[PDB]
């Protein structure tokens, strides 16, 4: 429940200010950044601050502090979900969102603040429908704005009828220093790119375990979705009954669903690294990278980020296949391999020096994160079975999909 | 069912060397269109199994099924959930609309020194009269 949502910069001056209740004074914003200087430098940083009775809900963009202020017991997730939405809608309008995006385009942005929220109550936040009466280039509001279907306007027409799906895997991994997998879940996310005519109701079916269990095909290949979070447009009451992915999509690119599942099978690529940290002297990383995944599959453009010490110096790299760049700016090495097929196992032998004087303070142990990408490859084994195009006009669309497996949080805790 | 001829003795050998009683993930063949085992193609396959031979009266098992089904997916592009049959109680009827084969119940040196299961049956009305639907009415609506 917002009263005054503000946008600050890295200095703390107001990029744009907008109140919704008047219950928070407009000059309260000048205490936030010193309290932000306070809480951070004592490590008491929270996304909510408090100068007396004014509560400072804020997120942080590249430059920006979307500070939403309130005083009462406001609904908190109501605030921040709107905060990332305003970032999103600005990202929908302004291809980069910085200080240039605000001060040059205050014509539209204040109008967005008038439109997205009244009183602290977000009422219209779908940017695609918002484009139709809030332009930076006014007519009546659309019926889709009035309509319960609030994501897809009628009369959308294309020459072709293309449904572009992107079943994207994101492998999380937590391997400790012991070499055991602590947490390796997979958060996959199907993101749709719809180019369709009119108002279609798309009905999707996958190799769901429960839907095959309801069918009686719970012995064949069936992915087990531990939880999915869907779009609004999915009629979840229809899905709650019988695993039915039925929806009217919006037009264009959108993530429909967000599935999450655990997987007790191996990581696609196992890393073995060593550290010969010689005191005052040097360090050595004889790191290998074996691919456990399928040999037909190839891990594209992998980027193995191994955290090196800060005052590490004189780099030497005995690779096998793939180049190293040393990034002292991140105090690390990126042993990059472009093409790395399954079954392959490439070593890299790193060698730095170390100053004969010690440093003053500790550094801590960041894990190793790599940046693999494997196309045409569902590690969880999810398969889209069909996509029912249902139009009252009636057409034969072109449904299309590609499979891409990337990392989620691919952290492997170092020595 | 042309490229299903070149592995017709080869994969069946791996089925027969499989007992009827590393790697991670699932690759997908690029740019090849995928579809389930359709009715007329199952009619094209049940006659492909009727004509090429070596299948009828063989000891059916699940390990042989999974060797077979993934080979269909990787060489012909068909979803490997089509060789599903009804469970334990009753005749193992296929849930597939178009599969005319029902499943009725029936090297050598890997043995130690001194020592201290289904089969097909052709039923051409399984394509029309879905007997597995008679065994599972509430699942098929």
């Amino acid at each position: 429940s917002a009263s005054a949502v503000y946008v600050l910069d890295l200095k703390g001056k107001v990029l744009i200010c907008r109140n919704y209740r008047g219950d928070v004074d407009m000059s309260e914003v000048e205490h936030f950044m010193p309290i932000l200087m306070e809480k951070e430098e004592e490590g008491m940083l929270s996304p909510i601050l408090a100068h007396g009775g004014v509560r400072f809900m804020w997120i942080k963009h590249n430059n920006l502090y979307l500070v939403a202020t309130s005083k009462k017991n406001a609904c908190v997730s109501l605030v921040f979900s709107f905060l990332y939405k305003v970032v999103q809608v600005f990202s929908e309008y302004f291809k980069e969102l910085e200080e240039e995006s605000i001060r040059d385009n205050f014509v539209i942005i204040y109008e967005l603040l008038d439109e997205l929220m009244d009183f602290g109550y977000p009422q219209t936040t779908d940017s695609k429908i918002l484009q139709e009466y809030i332009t930076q280039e006014a007519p009546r509001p659309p019926a889709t704005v009035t309509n319960a279907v609030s994501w897809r306007s009628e009369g959308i027409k294309y020459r072709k009828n293309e449904v572009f799906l992107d079943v994207i895997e994101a492998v999380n991994l937590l391997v400790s220093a012991n070499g055991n997998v602590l947490r390796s879940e997979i958060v996959g996310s199907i993101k749709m790119r719809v180019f369709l005519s009119g108002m279609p109701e798309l009905r999707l079916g996958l190799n769901d375990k429960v839907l095959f269990d309801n069918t009686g095909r719970g012995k064949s290949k069936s992915v087990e979705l531990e939880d999915v979070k869907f779009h609004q447009c999915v009629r979840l009451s229809r899905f709650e009954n019988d695993r039915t992915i039925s929806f009217i999509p919006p037009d264009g690119e959108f993530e429909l669903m967000s599935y999450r599942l655990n997987t007790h099978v191996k990581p696609l690529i196992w890393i073995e690294s060593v550290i010969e940290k010689h005191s005052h002297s040097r360090i050595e990383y004889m790191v290998k990278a074996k691919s456990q995944f399928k040999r037909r599959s190839t891990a594209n453009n992998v980027e193995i980020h191994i955290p090196v010490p800060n005052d590490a110096d004189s780099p030497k790299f005995k690779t096998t296949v793939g180049s190293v760049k040393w990034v002292p700016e991140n105090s690390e090495i990126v042993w990059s391999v472009k093409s790395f097929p399954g079954g392959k196992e490439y070593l890299m032998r790193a060698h730095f020096g170390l100053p004969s004087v010690e440093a003053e303070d500790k550094e801590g142990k960041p894990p190793i994160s790599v940046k693999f990408e494997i196309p045409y490859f569902t590690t969880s084994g999810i398969q889209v079975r069909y996509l029912k195009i249902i139009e009252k006009s009636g057409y034969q669309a072109l449904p299309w999909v590609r499979y891409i497996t990337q990392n989620g949080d691919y952290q492997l805790r170092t020595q | 069912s042309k490229s299903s001829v070149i592995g017709w003795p080869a994969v069946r050998e791996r089925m027969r060397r499989a007992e009827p009683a590393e790697e991670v993930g699932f690759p997908v063949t690029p740019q090849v269109p995928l579809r389930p085992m359709t009715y007329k193609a199952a009619v094209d396959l049940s006659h492909f199994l009727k004509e090429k031979g070596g299948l009828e009266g063989l000891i059916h098992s699940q390990r042989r099924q999974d060797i077979l089904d993934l080979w269909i997916y990787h060489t012909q592009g068909y979803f490997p959930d089509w060789q599903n049959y009804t469970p334990g109680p009753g005749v193992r009827y296929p849930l597939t609309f178009g599969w005319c084969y029902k499943l009725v119940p029936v090297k050598g040196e890997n043995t130690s020194l001194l020592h201290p299961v289904l089969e097909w049956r052709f039923d051409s009305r399984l394509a029309f009269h879905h007997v597995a639907r008679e065994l599972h009415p509430e699942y098929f609506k």
Partner: peptide, 13 residues
């Protein structure tokens, strides 16, 4: 998008 698409069925009856 340098990767290419693959067409799914429509109905899967």
């Amino acid at each position: 998008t340098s990767y290419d698409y693959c067409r799914v069925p429509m109905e899967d009856g």
